[PDB]
Amino acid sequence: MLRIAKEALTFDDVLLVPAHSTVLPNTADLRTRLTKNIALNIPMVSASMDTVTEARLAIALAQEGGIGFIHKNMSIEQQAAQVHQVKIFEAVTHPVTVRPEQTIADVMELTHYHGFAGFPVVTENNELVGIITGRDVRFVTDLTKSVAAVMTPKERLATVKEGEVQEKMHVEKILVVNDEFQLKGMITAKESKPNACKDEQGRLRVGAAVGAAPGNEERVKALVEAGVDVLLIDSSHGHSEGVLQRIRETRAAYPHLEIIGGNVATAEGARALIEAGVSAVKVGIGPGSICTTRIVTGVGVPQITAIADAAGVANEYGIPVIADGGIRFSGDISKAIAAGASCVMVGSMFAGTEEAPGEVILYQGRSYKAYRGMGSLGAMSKGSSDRYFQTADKLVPEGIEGRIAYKGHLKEIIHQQMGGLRSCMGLTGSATVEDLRTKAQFVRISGAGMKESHVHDVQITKEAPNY
Amino acid sequence: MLRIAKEALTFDDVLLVPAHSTVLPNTADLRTRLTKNIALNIPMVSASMDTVTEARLAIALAQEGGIGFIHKNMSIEQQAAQVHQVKIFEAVTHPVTVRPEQTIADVMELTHYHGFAGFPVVTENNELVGIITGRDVRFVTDLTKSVAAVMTPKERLATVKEGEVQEKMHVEKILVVNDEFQLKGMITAKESKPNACKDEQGRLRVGAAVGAAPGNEERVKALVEAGVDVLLIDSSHGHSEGVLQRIRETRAAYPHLEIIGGNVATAEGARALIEAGVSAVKVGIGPGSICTTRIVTGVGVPQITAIADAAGVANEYGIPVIADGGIRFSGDISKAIAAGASCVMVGSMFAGTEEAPGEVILYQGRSYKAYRGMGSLGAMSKGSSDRYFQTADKLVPEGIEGRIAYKGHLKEIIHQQMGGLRSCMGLTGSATVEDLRTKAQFVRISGAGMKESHVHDVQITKEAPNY
Amino acid sequence: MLRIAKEALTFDDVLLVPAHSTVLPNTADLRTRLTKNIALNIPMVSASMDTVTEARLAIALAQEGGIGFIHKNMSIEQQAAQVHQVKIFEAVTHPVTVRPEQTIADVMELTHYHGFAGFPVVTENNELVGIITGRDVRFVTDLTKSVAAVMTPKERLATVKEGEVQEKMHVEKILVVNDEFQLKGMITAKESKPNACKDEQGRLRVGAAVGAAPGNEERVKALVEAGVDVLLIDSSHGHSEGVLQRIRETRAAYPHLEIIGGNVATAEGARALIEAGVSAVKVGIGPGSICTTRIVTGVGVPQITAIADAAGVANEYGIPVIADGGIRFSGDISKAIAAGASCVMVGSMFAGTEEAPGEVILYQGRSYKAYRGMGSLGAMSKGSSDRYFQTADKLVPEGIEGRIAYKGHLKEIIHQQMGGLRSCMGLTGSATVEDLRTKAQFVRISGAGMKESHVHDVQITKEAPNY
Amino acid sequence: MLRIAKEALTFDDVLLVPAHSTVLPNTADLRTRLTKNIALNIPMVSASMDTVTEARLAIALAQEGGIGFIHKNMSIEQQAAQVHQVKIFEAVTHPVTVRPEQTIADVMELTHYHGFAGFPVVTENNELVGIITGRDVRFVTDLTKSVAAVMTPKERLATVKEGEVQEKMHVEKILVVNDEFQLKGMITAKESKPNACKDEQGRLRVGAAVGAAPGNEERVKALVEAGVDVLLIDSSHGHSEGVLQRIRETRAAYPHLEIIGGNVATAEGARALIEAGVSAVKVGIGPGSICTTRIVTGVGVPQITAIADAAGVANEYGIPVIADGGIRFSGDISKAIAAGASCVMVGSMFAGTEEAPGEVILYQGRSYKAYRGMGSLGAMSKGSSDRYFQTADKLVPEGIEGRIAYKGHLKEIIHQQMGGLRSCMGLTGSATVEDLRTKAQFVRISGAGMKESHVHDVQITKEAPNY
Ligand SMILES: COc1c(C)c2c(c(O)c1C/C=C(\C)CCC(=O)O)C(=O)OC2
Ligand SMILES: COc1c(C)c2c(c(O)c1C/C=C(\C)CCC(=O)O)C(=O)OC2
Ligand SMILES: COc1c(C)c2c(c(O)c1C/C=C(\C)CCC(=O)O)C(=O)OC2
Ligand SMILES: O=c1[nH]cnc2c1ncn2[C@@H]1O[C@H](COP(=O)(O)O)[C@@H](O)[C@H]1O
Ligand SMILES: O=c1[nH]cnc2c1ncn2[C@@H]1O[C@H](COP(=O)(O)O)[C@@H](O)[C@H]1O
Ligand SMILES: O=c1[nH]cnc2c1ncn2[C@@H]1O[C@H](COP(=O)(O)O)[C@@H](O)[C@H]1O
Ligand SMILES: O=c1[nH]cnc2c1ncn2[C@@H]1O[C@H](COP(=O)(O)O)[C@@H](O)[C@H]1O
Ligand SMILES: [K+]
Ligand SMILES: [K+]
Ligand SMILES: [K+]
Ligand SMILES: [K+]
């Protein structure tokens, strides 16, 4: 009579089972797939939220092996600039410089009559027209001569266009130019981040979100043109025709573009996304820390069941599932993977790190940052308006606005969390992320089983970095 | 051995499943049925409680698309007057006026020798006997003449009886009279509330409760005579013979009267109510916020199972179910509908609004209103007594007395709550209330699933209007 | 592999189902059986605990329709005296009196020369030897005569032996004597408590506990000789051979004595008690408010399942079940009955009433009384010792010592609680306790169902007498 | 689809069932097996943790009938010295003594011219070369003679080598020597601890842990050479090949050594340990009070199911199971045994006793001791380092550091806890630990059943010693 499918389960209803293992935590292999064609070094992506991911965090995350997704709550050029920033990220030097009109006396004023390498010569703005060296000047007496009658001319310089160049240097100092022969710096013949997630040309990978409303074409175009590695079409309802249509159109317009579509929480929803053309299915309706959808609307599916149901279909097409929302501890990452996901998307876990947007706030002598639902009033009010234009029709939010404890640097957080994954892989005898994802077993536990799992019956005196 | 049917479920044991959808929240259709013949524009009715619904709230609710139920804790004429108030609600002007005995000097005292429209002329009390205009007087010198020798006489006036009249005006100012030609105002040729729930003649709908005890005939009669749209026979035990008898008698006496009977919590109970003649089955034994029945008596049925069981029968006769009690958030409304209800009856959700009875109370520098069970001592003590008459026989209450946070205006609350319904209809791909009610699917969740549903693991900094 | 029977259930896991009803709460019939041959007017007995039941409460409870069980933590004669007190409870007057040696002047000193009824004449100690009346003296001048030469002699008095006598009075004042013709008072030709639980001779019923250890014979004998109506052999383990043996012996020694045996929590245990000869099976291992057995020992059975299992057997022999422990609200009484019990035994519910032993304690400006497990250290330390005698062998308690809020008078508590029963009987359409016990149905509910049952989502401003 | 075995259960999900019993708590038999060949007098062992077990507690526990396991967070010789200490524990006297060079005047200086037993004579360091008695001196005048010309020579002494000797005394005072004839004390012809757990030669039993990393051979060798009764190879992952290999090697090197291996939480894991050669299977992955494994890694198995699954296999080979972690109250011990374990290993239950390592700490005017996971940062930092050597590679802890309330003496704790076991054995009619372990039955209970089990609805005024 009551129309009810079986009991759906979330992270706290299950525990993974230990198994025979020849795997040590530090030998565990963390590599996995974000989409059919994009590899991750760690099974983490960052949420596309104005309180989690801008260029700063996207770069830091990619350096550690994951991919950040730039949020859409900014203008097109703003978003494209963010992507571009990530794509060109290098860490070049930017030397002291003179004019073709400046005199030798000007130069001697700078050098202080003791030897020097040289000064790149630049025009009114900002053309590079030569160089003057400690050997061009050592024996020039006439302090009145302009730098241009004694400089090494344009053609004797060794240069590169911005964007490894270390190949062309095989000469040991090279001047970076652009398309109008305009100086941008210098690089002088000299791996900090071996787990970096990078594209075929050794650039850091980045993603960016656009959402499903009509009229996104201009935004998509600019993001692809800025070299985005993966496009996320993010919606609170991936099973909506609107979303499927938007995915179809984007697939048809960029047949090689890796696209993530979601969110869904069912087999059917994962099926309709795959049919629309996604390269990856993003799963989660309502499990997010800052989410009130389940309460406001009554709709949702516990996240371990949502994952397994979406993966049941997505596996049949070779399509990876992304588990998005509700990850609170590193043991949830293990569980989301064993349920069928190839990686997890996280907000709160990364929010409040140094790298996330926003400044630190003090509240009762303790450190926090802003963290808010993308569907909260504040996140939505940066709507398209200016409130000058906007106003019986008030928005009904499905997210809250809050504060989250300051976490410090992203790198240490990732290391803490992946530690716990590695240890689970040793416990479950999973060599690779695939083995955890396809072979690990669960048991179902009661509320009393979950209390035994936590710390219990002792006073914690010190905070542990993973708990 | 132990006599036990299956596990019964309440709101927090279930979540609705998202589905393929061509529905947008703002295109969702909220219309539904209160009874076999009365349509609602929104699936909400207000509880019949002395701390929720009197004329004030009944009018405000009907203007928004629902129906209020006037409570019975007042005299017959009091209750009939409340219904009448709702039925005649308009928002007429009520102009300045003179006597047939008053002189022209009296008039000139009022006008101040500059032009005027006119003054309706009235008797000792309160008959209308004519009009005197700025053109009746402009050239009357004799300030001593009585208004009656120069007034426009009774028959040259254009008038209407109280109770659209805008048809007869096709003349642009019309004088409202009653049956003794007595003046009541004026209306001068001039839609704020398009979702208003209205009867075939464009009057706001209203309901009123009587309860099941013998001797209600006089009360019913007066309520029907006051134009009540729907009679509620409300009881803590709708499956009691007393209640069924009372419903039978009322059906026989008013074969066209829409009658709501309840409350029940079973198939059988819904069946016996339908057999007795109800136009709608009201469901809920014990789920109310202020209810202690379950604890005091040990009896009750979790409300999602109570709804589905009652709807299983009521569907077979085309009879709508009203889900009454236990609605706390807008997601519960979605759930109660998907379980089989056509609308929800709410107390606490509306209590504490400006429109509900009682004044605002301050308690520790914060705003509240009184909200009490109709079976609490205070609600019951307004019994029939005066305590002068009343007293080893003390009442045993099944409701408590309390306070509820001030909510502000009803209109904003309704908009907040229906927002969440609309969003669920988009999530579940339900175009109409019927589709949610008959096609949406649930999953069953654990206590851990319900914690994931809420906000979790972040500090809320601002209160969201729906949470 | 793990040796586990099905899920056992307690009060909060179930709710009763409303049903068709021709029963009104105030017409509900509360009468039930304590044992095969002893009727109760209300389905309550009081626990045999030194903080719940001594004569005071036993009398008050019997007057309301139940039976109190005097505890065993006192000497034999102490316990027999308590029983006796209950058995003889009447509410006699006790007039002013003179000596056969006292003079007329002594009498006139007392009367003050205005008329008087008379003075019963008594010996050195305390024999009754006659009467002197206002008419024996009115005309006796000689103030020196001793009362004995003018008294109405022994044989003209109308008298009764202690222990209705109102039959012999058919004469209107009668002098109460004992076996040595010794005066005890007077009763002068004059129903407050119609629900009183009484024996065939109109005396209040009382029970008394002895426990199962060897050597109880003397105690049993004295209790039977004091007119105890029902003997309780109370143990934390009724399925222990020791207990069954003790029951066997007592049955053989008093074939007509109603005996309660327990506690058990299984079919088997109820069977072995019946076989041993009990007139009633008492059920409950670990559910008591002050009990720590379940935690200390790991043993126990949730009380609704314990009841139904014990009743499954006990029903086949016509033997009533007593549900003992874990009753917190009046809805638990309804549930315990529907699970199969004929009445409930309560401790905390009665503890802290005026009538229970101990004085009121103030603790932070609020009223309490002592309430302790009979297996707590304090209850057990009144062992048999004096601590002078007693002491690597310390007792290991299965009960705690605590305080319970002052409740006031027992009568009001009973009325509050039976109110809730009556209302459940109306809700479930149970005319008699038997119908609730054998025909009412349960549903099983989740933790979320139990939260809906309570008060929720409102601030209680006043305490309700049943909640 | 989701890969899930049945619901696993922990202590609070179950209760034992009372049964027919001829067993009294004080007649219950507590003896059980630690391994195939080592008997315990009580079914308790202490955890191998630097905050629970060093020699002090190992000795106290063995005296009460259990076995302590010395932890490995110390050097080899340190650990061997601890074992040795336990093995030689006696409670000898150590008399006053003189030199062969000291004069009679020196002696008379000590005696004070009144009679004396005698003085054992010792060399430079520390050889025993004779004795001088109150009868050797009574008649020696020459105060200048050296003790050696008047002493009773080496050969007239009655002596024993360190390590019952009371047999050789059959002479009543005997001088304890070593292998270089060096004096160690004296024992003079004189059962406090009858439940002592002892080896075939009447020495207290002790265990010691080594862990599974390569290179443990030297440590094992020294522990065996120090007379360890049982070797524990303890790991957070007993199903890891590394652990199984280490067990294999140790079995092959010491075919008669009793070895405990673990921890596992499955049938398979218990099977692989038995195959590797263990004499006992230790069970528990994640249930420990101070454990965060379940949360950090997501892996674990509720402990009652982990026990029964491991015992299902281990029973088929006659191999005992040790239930390790998550024991909080004495009722958990009963449950762990009935689930299949032969004894329990405890940390927090013993931590904070006088005997456990560490000093008492005051924190807000109350007594505590340190208790920490062996996998917490602090426990692990005593790594092998000195931090001078050690440092993007920080450890990821699976244990926390905390404080636990001071418990007093271990003996009283054990007596409290075994009290509760004994009482359960009476309740379940289990004469021996074997009967509880193989015949007792469980019921499964809800969260509401567990609340009824606890104290509820009363204010505890005094702390009970077992709760
Ligand atoms: C896009 O971000 C999300 C996602 C991924 C999810 C939910 C959600 O509320 C939002 C924010 C809601 C927004 C931005 C409103 C616009 C819309 O999407 O129509 C959710 O409940 O599951 C998944
Ligand atoms: C007799 O009172 C009880 C009863 C009825 C129960 C329990 C209990 O602990 C005591 C007190 C325990 C005592 C007096 C110790 C003596 C003994 O009985 O051996 C329980 O857990 O279920 C039922
Ligand atoms: C050995 O002590 C344990 C045991 C028995 C268990 C766990 C645990 O974390 C530790 C401490 C973890 C350590 C010492 C890290 C070294 C390692 O073992 O690799 C657990 O979760 O179940 C059982
Ligand atoms: O306002 C919101 N309402 C509901 N879900 C949101 C909202 N904003 C973001 N989300 C989702 O919640 C996820 C983050 O969940 P978290 O890691 O548990 O903080 C995001 O990746 C989006 O899926
Ligand atoms: O005193 C009472 N006891 C139990 N139920 C009540 C009482 N008064 C009103 N009710 C019911 O509780 C409902 C309101 O529930 P609420 O919306 O959860 O506050 C009413 O519509 C009646 O069904
Ligand atoms: O010390 C004790 N330990 C366990 N049970 C007890 C103890 N003392 C009394 N009882 C039982 O607990 C019952 C009272 O339970 P209550 O009504 O829930 O307070 C008594 O009737 C006895 O069955
Ligand atoms: O740091 C740790 N993490 C997890 N388990 C631990 C750790 N240290 C000890 N243990 C285990 O926890 C047990 C003690 O559990 P307790 O009795 O519940 O305090 C030990 O016997 C080990 O099995
Ligand atoms: K949420
Ligand atoms: K309620
Ligand atoms: K209890
Ligand atoms: K734990």
Short mmCIF file of C-alpha atoms in Angstrom, two decimals, chain A residues 38-123:
data_model
loop_
_atom_site.label_atom_id
_atom_site.label_comp_id
_atom_site.label_asym_id
_atom_site.label_seq_id
_atom_site.Cartn_x
_atom_site.Cartn_y
_atom_site.Cartn_z
CA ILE A 38 41.13 11.88 -16.84
CA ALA A 39 43.28 10.24 -14.17
CA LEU A 40 43.59 11.43 -10.59
CA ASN A 41 46.52 10.75 -8.37
CA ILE A 42 44.24 10.89 -5.30
CA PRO A 43 40.50 10.18 -5.21
CA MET A 44 39.54 13.73 -4.18
CA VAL A 45 37.95 16.65 -6.00
CA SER A 46 36.94 19.95 -4.35
CA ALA A 47 33.34 21.27 -4.46
CA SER A 48 32.39 24.04 -6.80
CA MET A 49 31.41 26.51 -4.07
CA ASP A 50 32.21 30.19 -3.49
CA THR A 51 33.49 29.21 -0.04
CA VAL A 52 35.69 26.27 -1.12
CA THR A 53 37.24 26.59 -4.58
CA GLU A 54 38.87 29.47 -6.45
CA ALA A 55 42.23 29.40 -8.22
CA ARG A 56 44.13 29.40 -4.97
CA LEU A 57 42.71 26.09 -3.76
CA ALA A 58 42.41 24.58 -7.25
CA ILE A 59 46.20 24.94 -7.66
CA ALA A 60 47.00 23.62 -4.23
CA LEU A 61 44.74 20.59 -4.75
CA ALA A 62 46.08 19.73 -8.20
CA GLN A 63 49.63 19.91 -6.80
CA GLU A 64 48.58 17.16 -4.33
CA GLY A 65 46.98 14.94 -6.98
CA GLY A 66 43.31 16.00 -7.15
CA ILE A 67 41.29 18.52 -9.19
CA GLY A 68 39.56 21.72 -8.05
CA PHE A 69 36.32 22.92 -9.62
CA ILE A 70 36.10 26.74 -9.96
CA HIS A 71 32.61 27.95 -8.92
CA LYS A 72 30.29 29.87 -11.20
CA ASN A 73 29.32 32.71 -8.84
CA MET A 74 31.31 35.27 -10.75
CA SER A 75 31.37 36.69 -14.29
CA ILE A 76 32.42 34.72 -17.34
CA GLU A 77 35.74 36.49 -17.76
CA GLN A 78 36.28 36.18 -14.01
CA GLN A 79 35.82 32.42 -14.26
CA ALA A 80 37.87 32.02 -17.39
CA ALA A 81 40.66 34.10 -15.75
CA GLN A 82 40.60 31.70 -12.74
CA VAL A 83 40.93 28.64 -15.01
CA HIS A 84 43.71 30.28 -16.99
CA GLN A 85 45.55 31.11 -13.78
CA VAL A 86 45.53 27.42 -12.84
CA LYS A 87 46.60 26.29 -16.34
CA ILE A 88 49.66 28.56 -16.44
CA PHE A 89 50.74 28.05 -12.91
CA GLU A 90 54.51 27.51 -12.85
CA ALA A 91 56.14 27.75 -9.37
CA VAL A 92 60.37 32.63 -13.62
CA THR A 93 62.32 35.70 -12.38
CA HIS A 94 61.69 39.34 -13.41
CA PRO A 95 64.98 41.28 -13.61
CA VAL A 96 65.77 44.97 -13.24
CA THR A 97 65.50 46.79 -16.61
CA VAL A 98 66.36 50.04 -18.47
CA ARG A 99 65.25 52.28 -21.41
CA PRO A 100 66.84 52.82 -24.89
CA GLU A 101 66.67 56.53 -24.00
CA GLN A 102 68.43 56.26 -20.58
CA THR A 103 72.11 57.22 -20.50
CA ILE A 104 75.23 55.35 -19.37
CA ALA A 105 75.27 57.62 -16.28
CA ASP A 106 71.77 56.31 -15.45
CA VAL A 107 73.27 52.78 -15.68
CA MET A 108 76.33 53.54 -13.57
CA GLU A 109 73.92 55.12 -11.02
CA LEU A 110 72.34 51.63 -10.72
CA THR A 111 75.37 49.32 -10.89
CA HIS A 112 77.61 51.34 -8.50
CA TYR A 113 80.87 50.93 -10.50
CA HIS A 114 81.25 47.19 -9.60
CA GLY A 115 80.49 44.40 -12.12
CA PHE A 116 77.02 43.28 -13.26
CA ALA A 117 75.29 40.60 -15.39
CA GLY A 118 73.15 42.89 -17.59
CA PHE A 119 69.96 44.89 -18.03
CA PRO A 120 67.20 43.91 -20.52
CA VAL A 121 66.27 47.04 -22.53
CA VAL A 122 62.55 48.01 -22.84
CA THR A 123 60.48 50.60 -24.85
#
